[PDB]
Write an enzyme that holds these catalytic residues in place. Structure first.
Site, mmCIF file in Angstrom:
data_model
loop_
_atom_site.group_PDB
_atom_site.id
_atom_site.type_symbol
_atom_site.label_atom_id
_atom_site.label_comp_id
_atom_site.label_asym_id
_atom_site.label_seq_id
_atom_site.Cartn_x
_atom_site.Cartn_y
_atom_site.Cartn_z
ATOM 1 N N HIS A 41 41.874 44.329 42.946
ATOM 2 C CA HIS A 41 42.402 43.534 42.785
ATOM 3 C C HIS A 41 41.325 42.467 43.356
ATOM 4 C CE1 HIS A 41 44.451 43.882 46.486
ATOM 5 N NE2 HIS A 41 43.967 42.574 47.240
ATOM 6 N N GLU A 72 42.919 51.919 43.791
ATOM 7 C CA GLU A 72 42.439 50.589 44.630
ATOM 8 C C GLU A 72 41.241 50.510 45.117
ATOM 9 O OE1 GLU A 72 44.545 48.672 43.205
ATOM 10 O OE2 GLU A 72 43.685 46.740 43.963
ATOM 11 N N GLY A 146 45.354 36.890 53.389
ATOM 12 C CA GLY A 146 44.892 37.023 53.823
ATOM 13 C C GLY A 146 43.408 38.629 54.785
ATOM 14 N N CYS A 148 43.313 41.575 53.457
ATOM 15 C CA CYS A 148 42.797 42.638 51.861
ATOM 16 C C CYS A 148 41.933 42.731 52.453
ATOM 17 C CB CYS A 148 43.792 42.488 50.685
ATOM 18 S SG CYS A 148 45.348 42.939 50.789
#
Length: 182
Positions: A41, A72, A146, A148
């Site tokens: 992402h 991911e 904040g 990730c």
């Protein structure tokens, strides 16, 4: 404070950079040579900022499992003049549960941040922001925006990177040794 935080600090001090994309600032784990990981992402393009320096992306691969399900994790090769310490020998070979994990973050917003998250569950399937996702680890800490790309470690093992949460729980994508065979 203890040997968990010792191992986490050793990883943060040598194997992390601050990555900036058009989607934000992320903790980015360097694994070996010029190869790092980031949450998919982050939407890595042809150019990324590494510690606020313009850096060409030589390759980027958004990993999916053999059911063609999102994992991911994006593996990035950076046009950087310096190699990472090789930490592939600290990656698990198989999917597992863990005790006594630490989540460590280093960004402009959250410098030198370490969180004892405790027990980590092999959760498996998660609908993550509407995307079916596999190989998810879960910990019962109320993680926030904040974090990730944050590195999930135990003593001796680098087991995942933080990819989301629901306000009560946090979720990491597994790192497996097999992702980084060269």
């Amino acid at each position: 404070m203890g040997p968990g935080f010792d191992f986490a600090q050793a990883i943060m001090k040598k194997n992390t950079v601050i990555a900036r994309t058009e989607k934000g600032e992320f903790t980015m784990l360097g694994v070996y040579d010029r190869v790092a990981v980031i949450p998919t992402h982050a939407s890595v393009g042809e150019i990324i900022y590494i510690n606020d320096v313009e850096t060409r992306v030589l390759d980027a691969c958004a990993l999916r499992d053999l059911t063609d399900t999102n994992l991911e994790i994006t593996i990035v090769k950076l046009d950087r003049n310096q190699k990472f310490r090789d930490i592939r020998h600290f990656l698990p070979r198989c999917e597992d549960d863990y005790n006594d994990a630490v989540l460590s973050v280093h960004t402009s917003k959250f410098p030198n941040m370490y969180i004892p998250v405790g027990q980590v569950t092999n959760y498996g399937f998660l609908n993550l922001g509407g995307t079916p996702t596999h190989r998810i680890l879960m910990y019962n800490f109320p993680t926030r925006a904040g974090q990730c790309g944050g590195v999930v470690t135990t003593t001796g093992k680098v087991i995942g990177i933080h990819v989301g949460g629901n306000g009560a729980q946090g979720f990491a994508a597994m790192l497996l040794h097999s992702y980084f065979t060269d």
